[PDB]
Amino acid sequence: AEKPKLHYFNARGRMESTRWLLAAAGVEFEEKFIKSAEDLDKLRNDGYLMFQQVPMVEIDGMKLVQTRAILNYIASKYNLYGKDIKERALIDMYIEGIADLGEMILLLPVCPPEEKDAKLALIKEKIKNRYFPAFEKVLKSHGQDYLVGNKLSRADIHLVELLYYVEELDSSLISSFPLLKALKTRISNLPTVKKFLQPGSPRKPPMDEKSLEEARKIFRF
């Protein structure tokens, strides 16, 4: 057999949620880091990127691009996408809300400076008034340890990943949400996730100015 190969640059960006999901599932993977525009052009010219973009993951004979296509395949393959169509609908609704908030946070480094204060404030307001109340309500509704089906799913993984990013922005935002705090602790203690959180794993740090400059050179923006 062959390990999945993750093509991206050496940063969180749009590949980090896949790193989290594979690690949580206990699946070993390799990474091939793009370090220059030439490296990206070589993937393009070799025919490996359907829309000439990364993330790309080589898995099970496919060269899959598009974050959501990659994640959906991995979640189904490793039994992290619920047990039927209705559970998948709940999972999809939850994770698309997570993705909407995650996208706002992802794009902060490219926000025009004159708009950044207001953008950050609006994100914090949405966390406190829209997203954290919605997920706290799910957990309170059923009283169970996981978001869907009383069993670990991708929704728990994606949410807990997001909770780490929210903590980096403002550690007080989760303070009024005890069920979210408890979920963060439980998921972080699962053996595979605990290992991924320790040093030396593929988990990536927050993007710094040097990494942003590298992204500008690689992706030509």
DSSP letter string, 121-177: HHHHHHIIIIIHHHHHHHHHHH--SSSSTTS--HHHHHHHHHHHHHHHH-TTTTTT-
Q: Which CA distances in Å does 114 have to 111, 119, 123?
A: 8, 10, 16
Binding track, positions 7-26, relative to ligand GSN; x by CB under 6 A:
------xx------------
Residues 46-85 that bind ligand GSN (CB under 6 A): 52-55, 66-67
* 14/184 with CB nearer ligand GSN: 14
* 59/139 with CB nearer ligand GSN: 59
Q: Which CA distances in Å does 60 have to 64, 70, 109, 122?
A: 10, 11, 34, 41
Least gap, CB of 54 to ligand GSN (angstroms): 5
Q: Give yes or no for a contact between 56 and 5, defined as CB atoms under 8 angstroms apart.
A: no
Residues 166-195 that bind ligand GSN (CB under 6 A): none
Residues 98-117 that bind ligand GSN (CB under 6 A): none
* 67/153 with CB nearer ligand GSN: 67
Q: Give yes or no for a contact between 183 and 160, defined as CB atoms under 8 angstroms apart.
A: yes
Q: Which of residues 29, 73, 164, 219 is near ligand GSN by CB under 6 A?
A: 219
Please report, in range form, the residues annotated as the binding site.
Answer: 8, 44, 53-54, 66-67
Residues in touch with ligand GSN (CB under 6 A): 13-14, 52-55, 66-67, 219
